Amino acid sequence: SESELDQESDDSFFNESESESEADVDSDDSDAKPYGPDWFKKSEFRKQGGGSNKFLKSSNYDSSDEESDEEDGKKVVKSAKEKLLDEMQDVYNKISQAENSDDWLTISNEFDLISRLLVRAQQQNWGT
Numbered sequence: 001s002e003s004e005l006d007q008e009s010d011d012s013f014f015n016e017s018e019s020e021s022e023a024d025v026d027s028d029d030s031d032a033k034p035y036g037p038d039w040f041k042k043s044e045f046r047k048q049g050g051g052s053n054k055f056l057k058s059s060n061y062d063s064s065d066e067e068s069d070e071e072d073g074k075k076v077v078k079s080a081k082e083k084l085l086d087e088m089q090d091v092y093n094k095i096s097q098a099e100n101s102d103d104w105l106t107i108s109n110e111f112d113l114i115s116r117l118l119v120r121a122q123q124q125n126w127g128t
Contacts, residue, residue, distance in 0.1 A: 073104030080121035087115075 076098040085095055091114060094103055104122060111118040 067109075068105070070105070072102040072106075073100065074122065075099050075101055076104070076122050079124055080117045084115060084117050084121060 081095060081098060085092060091107065091110070094100060094107065095118075108119070108122070
């Protein structure tokens, strides 16, 4: 059995598909409004109807409303009574006693115009 051979042959080798080239990477970040007007200044706002209020009350005249709406008296001692005695002789005549309990209404219905001290003598609105 005889045969022959040869080594001048090939079937596979390297081959490139690329050569001169380049590449890169990039990134970015920012913060601002996309649109819309605005102001940086702060402030505060307030108003009122003049800061006060009026009423329909008025001075006395010929028409009236009521003659009695309270107890007829309460007694009085050690007060503005002690600077009101001896100023007069007729409407003072009960004031030197002041314990009568039931005549103080009748006198206060005229003392409104005689003396504002008599109202203070019976009421004693000093803050106690």
